[PDB]
Amino acid sequence: LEKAREDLAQIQAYIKNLKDVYTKQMEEKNELEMKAAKTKKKINTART
Amino acid sequence: TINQMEISLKEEEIQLNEATEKTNQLLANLDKESKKANQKGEEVAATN
């Protein structure tokens, strides 16, 4: 029972870490998309 | 000057769009490994 609770507590830590890395990866993705949109507007405005 | 501003903007946009796709692929792999880890903990917490 003791060993199970430790491993349960372990995974909860890993579980939360991987969610936090996921959220960071999504925020990075959004920032790059916003930069990618601005660069395209600069792209189009220059061609015109 | 404007023809240089066009080319530089587009190249950056493409470089950002390539970085996004890579970060989205990594995040998906991290989201799968998480769900696998999470499930193992829900099992381990139940064995307790």
> What is d(CA A12, CA B45) in angstroms, rounded to the nearest whole number?
10
Residue type, B4: Q
Q: Contact B18/A23 with Cβ under 8 angstroms?
A: no
Question: Between the CA of residue B31 and those of A16, A18, A32, B10, B20, what are the distances in Å?
Answer: 11, 7, 20, 31, 16
> What is d(CA B39, CA B48) in angstroms, rounded to the nearest whole number?
15
If we measure between CA atoms, which residue out of B17, B27, B15 comes closest to residue A23?
Answer: B27
DSSP assigned state of B1: -
The token pair that represents B24 in the structure block: 């989205």
A-facing residues of B in 1-48 (CB < 8 A) are 2-3, 5-7, 9-10, 12-13, 16-17, 19-20, 23-24, 26-27, 30-31, 33-34, 37-38, 40-41, 44-45, 47-48
> What is d(CA B19, CA A29) in angstroms, rounded to the nearest whole number?
8
Resolution of this deposited model, Å: 8.0
Please calculate the CA angle A15-A20-A23 and round it to the nearest 5 degrees: 125
Q: Contact A45/B7 with Cβ under 8 angstroms?
A: no
Determine, for residues B44 and A11 on separate chains, whether the beta-carbon distance falls below 8 Å. Answer: yes
Positions of chain breaks in chain B, given as the residue before each break (C to N > 2.5 Å): none
Place of tokens 């990594």: B26
The token pair that represents B4 in the structure block: 């240089």
> What is d(CA A39, CA B7) in angstroms, rounded to the nearest whole number?
10
